[PDB]
Design a protein around this motif. Structure first.
Motif, PDB file in Angstrom:
ATOM      1  N   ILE C 331      43.933  46.691  65.915  1.00 23.35           N
ATOM      2  CA  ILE C 331      43.288  46.182  67.118  1.00 23.35           C
ATOM      3  C   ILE C 331      42.679  44.827  66.798  1.00 23.35           C
ATOM      4  N   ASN C 332      41.768  44.802  65.831  1.00 25.91           N
ATOM      5  CA  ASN C 332      41.182  43.560  65.361  1.00 25.91           C
ATOM      6  C   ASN C 332      40.790  43.747  63.906  1.00 25.91           C
ATOM      7  N   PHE C 333      40.664  42.631  63.201  1.00 22.75           N
ATOM      8  CA  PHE C 333      40.427  42.640  61.768  1.00 22.75           C
ATOM      9  C   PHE C 333      39.268  41.712  61.434  1.00 22.75           C
ATOM     10  N   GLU C 334      38.864  41.741  60.162  1.00 22.54           N
ATOM     11  CA  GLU C 334      37.853  40.814  59.657  1.00 22.54           C
ATOM     12  C   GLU C 334      38.067  40.686  58.151  1.00 22.54           C
ATOM     13  N   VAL C 335      38.674  39.582  57.734  1.00 19.14           N
ATOM     14  CA  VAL C 335      38.937  39.305  56.328  1.00 19.14           C
ATOM     15  C   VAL C 335      38.007  38.186  55.893  1.00 19.14           C
ATOM     16  N   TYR C 336      37.216  38.444  54.856  1.00 23.88           N
ATOM     17  CA  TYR C 336      36.276  37.454  54.362  1.00 23.88           C
ATOM     18  C   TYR C 336      36.026  37.702  52.885  1.00 23.88           C
ATOM     19  N   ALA C 337      35.644  36.642  52.183  1.00 27.73           N
ATOM     20  CA  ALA C 337      35.193  36.778  50.808  1.00 27.73           C
ATOM     21  C   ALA C 337      33.799  37.381  50.797  1.00 27.73           C
ATOM     22  N   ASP C 338      33.589  38.341  49.910  1.00 31.89           N
ATOM     23  CA  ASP C 338      32.349  39.112  49.888  1.00 31.89           C
ATOM     24  C   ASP C 338      31.193  38.248  49.403  1.00 31.89           C
ATOM     25  N   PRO C 339      30.130  38.071  50.192  1.00 33.17           N
ATOM     26  CA  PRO C 339      29.029  37.210  49.737  1.00 33.17           C
ATOM     27  C   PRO C 339      28.162  37.857  48.678  1.00 33.17           C
ATOM     28  N   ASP C 340      28.076  39.185  48.654  1.00 36.17           N
ATOM     29  CA  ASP C 340      27.231  39.873  47.689  1.00 36.17           C
ATOM     30  C   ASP C 340      27.958  40.179  46.388  1.00 36.17           C
ATOM     31  N   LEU C 341      29.184  40.691  46.466  1.00 32.19           N
ATOM     32  CA  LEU C 341      29.910  41.099  45.274  1.00 32.19           C
ATOM     33  C   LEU C 341      30.505  39.933  44.501  1.00 32.19           C
ATOM     34  N   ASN C 342      30.547  38.737  45.082  1.00 30.03           N
ATOM     35  CA  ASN C 342      30.954  37.546  44.345  1.00 30.03           C
ATOM     36  C   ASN C 342      29.693  36.868  43.820  1.00 30.03           C
ATOM     37  N   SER C 343      29.113  37.477  42.796  1.00 29.61           N
ATOM     38  CA  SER C 343      27.936  36.920  42.158  1.00 29.61           C
ATOM     39  C   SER C 343      28.367  35.950  41.064  1.00 29.61           C
ATOM     40  N   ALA C 344      27.389  35.329  40.405  1.00 27.37           N
ATOM     41  CA  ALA C 344      27.715  34.418  39.316  1.00 27.37           C
ATOM     42  C   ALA C 344      28.142  35.171  38.067  1.00 27.37           C
ATOM     43  N   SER C 345      27.670  36.403  37.899  1.00 19.57           N
ATOM     44  CA  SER C 345      28.043  37.206  36.747  1.00 19.57           C
ATOM     45  C   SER C 345      29.328  37.991  36.958  1.00 19.57           C
ATOM     46  N   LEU C 347      31.892  36.651  38.759  1.00 16.30           N
ATOM     47  CA  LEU C 347      32.933  35.634  38.687  1.00 16.30           C
ATOM     48  C   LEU C 347      33.141  35.149  37.261  1.00 16.30           C
ATOM     49  N   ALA C 348      32.120  35.259  36.411  1.00 11.41           N
ATOM     50  CA  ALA C 348      32.249  34.855  35.017  1.00 11.41           C
ATOM     51  C   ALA C 348      33.067  35.835  34.193  1.00 11.41           C
ATOM     52  N   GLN C 349      33.343  37.025  34.714  1.00 13.00           N
ATOM     53  CA  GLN C 349      34.229  37.978  34.069  1.00 13.00           C
ATOM     54  C   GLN C 349      35.638  37.928  34.631  1.00 13.00           C
ATOM     55  N   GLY C 350      35.878  37.097  35.636  1.00  8.33           N
ATOM     56  CA  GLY C 350      37.168  37.030  36.275  1.00  8.33           C
ATOM     57  C   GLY C 350      37.331  37.922  37.479  1.00  8.33           C
ATOM     58  N   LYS C 351      36.259  38.535  37.964  1.00  9.21           N
ATOM     59  CA  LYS C 351      36.315  39.406  39.128  1.00  9.21           C
ATOM     60  C   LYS C 351      35.907  38.626  40.366  1.00  9.21           C
ATOM     61  N   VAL C 352      36.726  38.697  41.410  1.00 10.86           N
ATOM     62  CA  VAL C 352      36.429  38.052  42.682  1.00 10.86           C
ATOM     63  C   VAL C 352      36.837  39.013  43.794  1.00 10.86           C
ATOM     64  N   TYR C 353      35.952  39.211  44.766  1.00 10.14           N
ATOM     65  CA  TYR C 353      36.076  40.302  45.721  1.00 10.14           C
ATOM     66  C   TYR C 353      36.389  39.775  47.113  1.00 10.14           C
ATOM     67  N   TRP C 354      37.292  40.466  47.806  1.00 12.12           N
ATOM     68  CA  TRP C 354      37.602  40.196  49.202  1.00 12.12           C
ATOM     69  C   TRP C 354      37.469  41.483  49.996  1.00 12.12           C
TER      70      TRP C 354
ATOM     71  N   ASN D  29      40.907  39.588  37.679  1.00 11.74           N
ATOM     72  CA  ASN D  29      40.855  40.804  38.487  1.00 11.74           C
ATOM     73  C   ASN D  29      40.516  40.475  39.933  1.00 11.74           C
ATOM     74  N   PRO D  30      41.504  40.054  40.730  1.00 12.78           N
ATOM     75  CA  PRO D  30      41.247  39.904  42.165  1.00 12.78           C
ATOM     76  C   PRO D  30      41.141  41.250  42.861  1.00 12.78           C
ATOM     77  N   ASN D  31      39.926  41.636  43.228  1.00 17.48           N
ATOM     78  CA  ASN D  31      39.694  42.919  43.868  1.00 17.48           C
ATOM     79  C   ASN D  31      39.795  42.784  45.376  1.00 17.48           C
ATOM     80  N   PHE D  32      40.434  43.761  46.004  1.00 18.22           N
ATOM     81  CA  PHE D  32      40.514  43.835  47.453  1.00 18.22           C
ATOM     82  C   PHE D  32      39.936  45.164  47.898  1.00 18.22           C
ATOM     83  N   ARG D  33      39.106  45.120  48.932  1.00 16.55           N
ATOM     84  CA  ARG D  33      38.429  46.302  49.446  1.00 16.55           C
ATOM     85  C   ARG D  33      38.826  46.474  50.903  1.00 16.55           C
TER      86      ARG D  33
END
Lengths: 99, 49, 383, 46, 48
Positions: C331-345, C347-354, D29-33
């Motif tokens: 019906i409708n969607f919402e795709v965004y980069a996570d403002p909370d889970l993309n912290s500085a610590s 991202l320094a491990q290589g983890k980036v959340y969507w 590790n590109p995580n998708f939720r």
């Protein structure tokens, strides 16, 4: 149009065939091709010319010429000189994608 | 395809240059030397070497 | 001087495209008799794409060709058939459909469907073992297998009464199980009489037809089964009564075949205890958008987190969900980069959340109408 | 550096500069939720 | 490296839906004569 990749011989049509033709044209000189002395670019002759406002009028022409002659499936958007660092001239070339 | 049409054309020109080099009405240079040496004919000497 | 010449670089910061993994590959495993006419070894998977290929690989008259006949008469899809050999006891037949592993280190029964992606590039989305799924050993080994493949294992209950079909469906409770209880009574071309079919391959012919005609977001729960000509122990659903015999089975998360000889599949509730994952539509679209993202984002595993990297994954992710919105899948969607889970610590491990939040289009299993007479327009007849 | 550039450090010739930066970490590790929300379920009304 | 690869996770934090238990099942118990026409046993429940 379907062509072959330059390295590895793979048949690719849209994405890298449009890129292996434009990125080759900017560094292939004139007369390097056999029996085709008008293919190539004057960009290899634009080396060590003084970077003036009349020089950018030539490079934006020679990008529009050498791609306008032998690559009609690419629409050129903008050739903006964005940085002069140490004699190195950064020319941004954003091209549209077709097909 | 512009090497296979140019390098073949160089082989077509070698055959035409070699076929002229064994004909009396077209040979020149060191190719009339081989026709001349067969018939005991040598090139003259106007001034010495 | 770093480099003296002309440099032509490729920055390569375009948003890629995401394709769906075709949503209709059927994993089949049933008995077949190996011999001269059967061109398949009794434990290896065989890719099937036509009815002629199913008879040329397993032979006419096999129990797995009769399952391929039920699928290809209704739909046109890709079947990953395994095929097992006939055992002496019917208990040992259930040990062969489950399979396990062989002494050569190879998978044997239903476990060979895990080799369907590494050998044919087609992961099976419909796990069907017709006739053997009434046994609880095979159905609970196909339930754990359906989570390894993110597939919807189509069970079929026993052909006993509705008390024994509800008590059979009270054992599973897992959201990737779809139970079709009443047995299809189909006409046999050999004996020229009506034989009983397990009504599980015919459901697979509907999950593979509605994805190629209506989409994977459309439930097959009102679509015709063309091949059938009967139903053993026929169910009752008359007009609109909430207390029908077929409606007491759909209440217990069991799909039925309602009409005269069951030319309509009836039921879109999977065997799920959570009412969130109750519909087969929501389970199927979730496992399809969780594998399109997984198999479609293997280009971004060491790209380097720049500002044009996060933006060109998100814009390549909205463009996948916007090609699903106008298609009718969501019906409708919402795709965004996570403002909370993309912290500085992080991202320094290589983890980036969507975060991909969307809304599935639910199936209208009950259009309720509220008709009423009024007197508001009774004063209209005056002029 | 406003601290390490003292009067006595500069009198020996020592003069300090700080270059702080962040590198570009590889997205190992590109995580998708993915979440099925019923928030837009009320959008089908007209 | 905790995991080198792509994770796709279903977080499963939505609200659920609550349905009513149909309110209209009538438990009955009265006498009858078991025989040939009666297809039941004299103590077991029968769904009607």
């Amino acid at each position: 149009m379907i062509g072959m990749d330059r390295r590895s011989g793979l048949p690719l049509s849209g994405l890298a065939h449009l890129k292996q033709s434009v990125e080759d044209i900017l560094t292939t000189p004139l007369g390097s091709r056999r029996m085709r002395p008008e293919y190539g670019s004057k960009l290899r002759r634009m080396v060590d010319m003084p970077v003036s406002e009349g020089w950018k009028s030539a490079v934006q022409a020679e990008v529009a010429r050498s791609l306008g002659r032998w690559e009609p499936r690419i629409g050129l958007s903008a050739v903006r000189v964005v940085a002069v660092v140490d004699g190195r001239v950064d020319l941004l070339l954003s091209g549209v994608f077709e097909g | 395809l512009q090497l296979a049409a140019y390098r073949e054309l160089l082989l077509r020109a070698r055959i035409n240059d070699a076929a002229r080099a064994v004909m009396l009405a077209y040979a020149s240079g060191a190719d009339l030397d081989q026709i001349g040496a067969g018939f005991n004919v040598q090139r003259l000497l106007i001034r010495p070497a | 001087s770093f480099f003296h010449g002309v440099t032509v670089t490729n920055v390569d910061i375009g948003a890629r495209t995401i394709a769906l993994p075709a949503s209709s590959v059927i994993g089949l495993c049933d008995v077949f008799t190996p011999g001269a006419q059967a061109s398949a070894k009794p434990n290896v998977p065989v890719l099937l794409t036509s009815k002629k290929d199913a008879a040329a690989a397993f032979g006419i008259g096999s129990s797995i060709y009769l399952a391929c006949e039920a699928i290809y008469n209704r739909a046109q899809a890709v079947i990953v058939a395994v095929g097992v050999e006939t055992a002496e006891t019917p208990e040992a037949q259930a040990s062969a459909v489950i399979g396990g592993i062989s002494a050569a280190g190879e998978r044997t029964g239903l476990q060979a469907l895990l080799d369907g992606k590494s050998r044919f590039n087609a992961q099976p989305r419909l796990l069907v073992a017709p006739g053997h799924s009434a046994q609880q050993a095979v159905a609970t080994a196909m339930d754990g297998l359906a989570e390894k493949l993110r597939a919807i294992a189509i069970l079929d209950g026993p052909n006993s009464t509705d008390e024994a079909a509800v008590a059979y469906a009270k054992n599973f409770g897992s959201k990737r199980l779809f139970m079709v209880d009443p047995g299809v009574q189909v006409w046999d071309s050999a004996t020229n009489a009506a034989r009983n079919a397990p009504a599980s391959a015919y459901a697979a012919g509907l999950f593979a037809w509605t994805d190629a005609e209506y989409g994977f977001w459309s439930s097959p729960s009102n679509k015709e089964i063309k091949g059938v000509t009967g139903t053993s122990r026929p169910v009752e659903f008359l007009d609109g009564d909430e207390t029908c015999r077929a409606n007491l089975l759909n209440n217990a998360n069991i799909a039925t075949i309602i009409r005269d000889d069951g030319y309509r599949l009836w039921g879109n509730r999977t065997l799920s205890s959570d009412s969130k994952w109750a519909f087969v539509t929501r389970v199927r679209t979730m496992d399809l958008v969780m594998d399109a993202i997984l198999a479609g984002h293997k280009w971004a595993v060491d790209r380097g987190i720049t500002k044009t990297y996060v933006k060109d994954v998100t814009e390549g992710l909205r463009a996948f969900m916007r090609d699903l919105k106008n298609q009718g899948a969501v019906i409708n969607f919402e795709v965004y980069a996570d403002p909370d889970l993309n912290s500085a610590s992080q991202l320094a491990q290589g983890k980036v959340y969507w975060n991909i939040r969307f809304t599935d289009v639910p199936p209208a299993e009950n259009p309720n109408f509220r008709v009423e007479v009024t007197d508001q327009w009774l004063t209209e007849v005056l002029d």
